[PDB]
Design a protein around this ligand. Sequence first.
Ligand SMILES: CCc1c[nH]c2ncc(-c3c(C(=O)O)c(C)nn3C)cc12
Length: 167
Amino acid sequence: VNSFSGYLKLTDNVYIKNADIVEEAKKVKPTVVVNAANVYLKHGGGVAGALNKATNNAMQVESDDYIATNGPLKVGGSCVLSGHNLAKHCLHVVGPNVNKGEDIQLLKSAYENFNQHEVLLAPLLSAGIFGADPIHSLRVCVDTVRTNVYLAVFDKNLYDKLVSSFL
Ligand SMILES: CCc1c[nH]c2ncc(-c3c(C(=O)O)c(C)nn3C)cc12
């Protein structure tokens, strides 16, 4: 039993809810919240900008030190950093950004990072300002992640479309 509430069950291990991932993280304080990161961990907008703002920019300060030491992530890669006031840990995962021409096949590699964590609160990778089709992102998630994932979808219209079209 865990503390996640109000989710629709899609499969044995995937759950989905119309929610703001920031407010959901604040309320549950999950072990892991996933950030929709870019390779530079520049958390300017989208999910990343919202998560970072909620940490009062502490996520960005930590991230800048990480990049200065380690260099950029790979598209499809991830790193574990602090969850600050939102979670124990933040798993920063880089899905391909279609608006940069990145290969959508890398979306499966991105979701494979979730399998290193037993339970996660997450957005749909490569959705929103990353330009991919969220219906496709949900399909890759379900077909790749084997651990227990709780997906937060900000847009109510999109959430209803994702549920109604789910095979
Ligand atoms: C609609 C207003 C809004 C405020 N904050 C948001 N955060 C994320 C998304 C969003 C998501 C998500 O993860 O829910 C996905 C997937 N695509 N898009 C575009 C939308 C908003």
